[PDB]
Amino acid sequence: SHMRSSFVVLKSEAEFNSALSKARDGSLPSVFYFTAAWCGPCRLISPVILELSNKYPDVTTYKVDIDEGGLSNAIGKLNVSAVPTLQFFKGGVKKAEIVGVDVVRLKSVMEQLYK
């Protein structure tokens, strides 16, 4: 289970631009989860994100399916070249990135940044 508002599935580039402005200009604690429907291993990450959302309720995590219409431009805006990629924002700036499946590091980075 999870809190509904803490996990957001973006559907348009306008939605992504809004979320990135929240993470930068708004200085809101934000995680961007870059994935693709055709990436099987990527699906290992989503359950862990939801599990951790309860521990860090101020954080909002955004799922960015790069195979969605328009969202293909998100990988250019944040310099993404592999799936899964997780990017972590705090204080209006990018604080960390995890490329590939690394669940242990995901748990450790969330604690390090947002505890």
Residue numbers in the entry: -1 to 113
From the paper:
TRXo1 and TRXo2 share high levels of sequence identity and similarity (74% and 97%, respectively) and their crystal structures are quite similar and overlay well (RMSD of 0.9 Å).
TRXo1 crystallized in the orthorhombic space group P212121 whereas TRXo2 crystallized in the hexagonal system and belonged to space group P65. Well-diffracting crystals of TRXo1 and TRXo2 were obtained with one molecule per asymmetric unit (a.s.u) with Matthews’s coefficient (Vm) values of 2.3 Å3 Da−l and 2.0 Å3 Da−l corresponding to solvent contents of 46% and 40%, respectively. Their structures were determined by molecular replacement at high resolution of 1.80 and 1.50 Å, respectively. The distances between Cys37 and Cys40 Sγ atoms are 2.03 and 2.05 Å in TRXo1 and TRXo2, respectively. They represent the typical length of disulfide bonds, suggesting that both TRXo isoforms were crystallized in an oxidized form. Close examination of the resultant Fo-Fc electron density maps revealed a negative density between Cys37 and Cys40 in TRXo2, and additional positive density in the opposite sides of Sγ atoms. Refinements, using PHENIX and Coot in an iterative manner, indicated that this effect is an artifact of data collection (radiation damage), due to partial reduction of the disulfide bond by the X-ray beam during data collection. In TRXo1 and TRXo2 X-ray structures, the distance between the sidechain hydroxyl of the Tyr31 and the Cys40 Sγ atom are 3.76 and 5.51 Å, respectively, too far away for an interaction. The NH1 guanidinium nitrogen of Arg41 is hydrogen-bonded to the carbonyl oxygen of Ser74 (2.85 Å) in TRXo1 and to the carbonyl oxygen of Ala12 (3.50 Å) in TRXo2. Even though TRXo1 was crystallized at pH 7.5 whereas TRXo2 was crystallized at pH 5.6, which may explain differences in the solvation shell, TRXo2 would be more positively charged than TRXo1 in a pH range between 5 and 10. With a pH value of 8.1 ± 0.2 for the mitochondrial matrix of A. thaliana, the global charge of TRXo1 and TRXo2 in vivo should be quite different with values of −1 and +2, respectively.
